[PDB]
């Protein structure tokens, strides 16, 4: 039934769909090249693999999209499992379900697993829940072997917890990804102008001009925003003054609920 | 413009255990290490100036402070709850004693006049305590040297040697070896540094950490002359170089 998680993999999809900050995109791919295509190298040195990794990027920047693309590169089963989604008042229901998670997981390798919003993870109640945080970290590299099954924690609250990050030999590649510049903002329109008509000119100069703080989701929503009332023109191309009639208010909801983004 | 928080900020426990000071004495430990040792020839103190950035001076920051010409002091824990306390002691040594018996006081009578405000920070209303426990050195022609540790509750230990902070107990586990009675001062810096070398992870240079001592009469500091009677400032601080001259000499 966790099929509901682990059933978004089969259709092959390109790793090209996001440019982003390429050097990080060069990082996680090259380090995960190794088990699949060139595992000879670990043998010629005789060094253990990367026992799973994590990352950080603030919200709504293709993080799950990034993860959801990699499993289609090679044929894993990309799961979807919110941290808070697995949260129940029942004590063992926390620590029982996780054990059944790895269970079906190791029942099917070479595959892949994912988490995002784990940042939530002397008083009476709290003295039991740290054990969950003390359990699973043990279940990474406590006693058992792990062949071809890995994990990412991809949060938006990087003040998560000292001990999981206190000894970064358990996990590694504790990477970051910040938000775009024009350097990033510009090329992102190329994929987002891919399957749509347009006039043809260096129109994206307004892109570097403004949008200094948006992310990828809304600019994508800004694209379709322009196309809606661009049909009043109804032309067989699209103009960059079109979008300008809505770039304001999208920022005014991007204005709404101002939240900060530090990296750690 | 209206005051209504005049209640106490303080709370009894079932079994004593006054709350919001027992929490205070975490930060005193979270702060840096610092120490103090005596001997009949003289007295010493020291700390470690943890310069945060590579930008800040250490000249501007007084992790060691002068109280009178014959006293020093030092802390660990928090700073702004230390800077204020100096001046509220300096203004007291005069406004109770020094303008009233002429001579500056012995060391402990001063200490009665810091706990007598430190206490008021708690039993009064609308306030918190100073998150600090600091140290004093001693001198007087009628009772001699001494150290005197204080603490935010209002107590004050005496000592022959001690230390505090993020490396305290290890030192207290150490110095009970190093201390003895047959002591001059020129020896006391080796052990004091040699102590404070082991409890550090960063740089260990003379321009990084300040300390100071209790020497003997030094009329060159006094500014004027002609009166052979006067006793000059026994207190004194060291420079950048004279630290390193010891360090090379190990």
């Amino acid at each position: 039934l966790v099929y509901n998680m682990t059933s978004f993999e089969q259709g092959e999809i390109t790793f090209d769909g996001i440019g982003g900050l390429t050097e990080q995109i060069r990082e996680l791919r090259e380090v995960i090249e190794l088990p699949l295509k060139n595992p000879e190298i670990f043998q010629r040195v005789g060094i253990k693999p990367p026992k799973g990794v994590l990352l950080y990027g603030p919200p709504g920047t293709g993080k799950t999209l990034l993860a959801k693309a990699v499993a289609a590169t090679i044929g894993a089963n990309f799961i979807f499992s919110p941290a808070s989604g697995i949260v129940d008042k029942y004590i063992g229901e926390s620590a029982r379900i996780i054990r059944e998670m790895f269970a079906y997981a190791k029942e099917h390798e070479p595959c892949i697993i994912f988490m995002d919003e784990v940042d939530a993870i002397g008083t009476s109640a709290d003295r039991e829940i740290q054990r969950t945080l003390m359990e699973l970290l043990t279940q990474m590299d406590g006693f058992d072997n792990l062949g071809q099954t890995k994990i990412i924690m991809a949060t938006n609250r990087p003040d998560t917890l000292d001990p999981a990050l206190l000894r970064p030999g358990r996990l590694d590649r504790k990477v970051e990804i910040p938000l775009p510049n024009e350097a990033g903002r510009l090329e992102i329109f190329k994929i987002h102008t891919a399957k749509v008509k347009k006039t043809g000119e260096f129109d994206f100069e307004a892109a570097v001009k403004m949008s200094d703080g948006f992310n990828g989701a809304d600019i994508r929503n800004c694209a379709t925003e322009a196309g809606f009332f661009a049909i009043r023109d109804d032309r067989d191309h699209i103009n960059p003054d079109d979008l300008m009639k809505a770039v304001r208010k999208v920022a005014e909801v991007k204005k709404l609920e101002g939240t900060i983004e530090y990296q750690k | 413009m209206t005051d209504r928080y005049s209640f106490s900020l303080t709370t009894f426990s079932p079994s004593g255990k006054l709350g919001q000071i027992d929490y205070a004495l975490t930060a005193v430990k979270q702060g840096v290490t610092s120490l103090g040792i005596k001997a009949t020839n003289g007295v010493v103190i020291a700390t470690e100036k943890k310069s945060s950035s590579p930008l800040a001076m250490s000249e501007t920051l007084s992790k060691v402070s002068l109280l009178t010409p014959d006293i020093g002091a030092v802390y660990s824990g928090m700073g702004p709850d230390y800077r204020v306390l100096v001046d509220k002691s300096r203004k007291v040594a005069h406004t109770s004693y020094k303008r009233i018996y002429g001579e500056y006081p012995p060391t402990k009578l001063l200490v009665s006049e810091v706990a007598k405000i430190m206490q008021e920070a708690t039993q009064s209303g609308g306030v918190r305590p100073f998150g600090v426990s600091l140290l004093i050195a001693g001198h007087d022609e009628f009772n001699g040297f001494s150290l005197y540790q204080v603490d935010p509750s209002g107590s004050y230990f005496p000592w022959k040697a001690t230390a505090i902070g993020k490396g305290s107990v290890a030192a207290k586990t150490f110095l009970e070896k190093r201390w003895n009675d047959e002591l001059e001062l020129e020896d006391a810096i080796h052990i004091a540094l040699l102590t404070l070398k082991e409890s550090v992870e960063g740089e260990f240079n003379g321009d990084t950490i300040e300390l100071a001592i209790i020497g003997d009469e030094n009329p060159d500091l006094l500014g004027y002359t002609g009166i052979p009677t006067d006793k000059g400032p026994r207190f004194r601080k060291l420079t950048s170089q004279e630290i390193n001259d010891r360090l090379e000499a190990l």
Partner: protein, 273 residues
């Protein structure tokens, strides 16, 4: 179920393996021994062959190790719950077993029970937070003192036990529902003396031996420490290939207790004198 029941395989202990403990047997056997040894004798007066008793005291004692030997030299049975096993993750399983419990001993008058721990059935309070466990402490006490318990108290004495005393329900105790209690304290020094005589029976025509010269020194609470130091004393001899043993090799074994006798670090807080 009869797994809880008594045994055709009794343990092999004895109440003369138990040095230092000298007076308590005289103070507690009789309620378990005498009027059941002679009900006509007791019935000459017949005051009340009371209900069970209780023992309180720290660990380090062998209250257990006492209770293992009493099941030898009995004339009666000695059942065991393997404490707190009676409860399950349900409701109805509670009272039936207790109903099954008494009757299992009604058929055996000269026969008794054992608890070790009643820290888990103590101090019932409820405003929505609580548990079914509180339900079962009643019915046992109900069938302890009711129309059908005194016939057991005609047939039965019992005992409870724990290591922490005042953390339970006083509404439990109607003194008479439990007619006597006792302390198992930590030992005296000289009480400790005859202990190591028991367990170190391994010297080999050796000499220069001063068994008194160890409770000379101790300020502990346990008697089991006499074994903890003894048992690892021989480990030294075990590693160094010489079976023999002496005082000093046996003495620094307290160095293991150099932690225990000194693990309790101390605070410097002179807030109040």
């Amino acid at each position: 179920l009869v797994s809880l029941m008594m045994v055709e395989k009794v343990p092999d202990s004895t109440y003369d393996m138990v040095g230092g403990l000298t007076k308590q047997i005289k103070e507690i056997k009789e309620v378990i021994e005498l009027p059941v040894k002679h009900p006509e004798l007791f019935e000459s007066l017949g005051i009340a062959q009371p209900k069970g008793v209780i023992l309180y005291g720290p660990p380090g004692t062998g209250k257990t190790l006492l209770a293992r030997a009493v099941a030898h030299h009995t004339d009666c049975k000695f059942i065991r719950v393997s404490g707190a096993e009676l409860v399950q993750k349900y409701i109805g399983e509670g009272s039936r077993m207790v109903r099954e419990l008494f009757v299992m001993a009604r058929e055996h008058a000269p026969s008794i029970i054992f608890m070790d721990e009643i820290d888990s059935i103590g101090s019932t309070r409820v405003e929505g937070s609580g548990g079914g466990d509180s339900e079962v402490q009643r019915t046992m006490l109900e069938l302890l003192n009711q129309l059908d318990g005194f016939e057991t108290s005609k047939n039965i004495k019992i005992i409870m036990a724990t290591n922490r005393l005042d953390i339970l329900d006083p509404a439990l105790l109607r003194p008479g529902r439990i007619d006597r209690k006792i302390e198992f304290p930590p030992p005296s020094v000289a009480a400790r003396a005859e202990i190591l005589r028991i367990h170190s029976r391994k010297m080999n025509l050796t000499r220069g031996i001063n068994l008194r010269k160890v409770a000379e020194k101790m300020n502990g609470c346990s008697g089991a420490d006499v074994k903890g130091v003894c048992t690892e004393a021989g480990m030294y001899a075990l590693r160094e290939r010489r079976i023999h043993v002496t005082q000093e090799d046996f003495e620094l074994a307290v160095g293991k207790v150099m932690n225990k006798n000194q693990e309790t670090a101390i605070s410097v807080a002179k807030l109040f004198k």
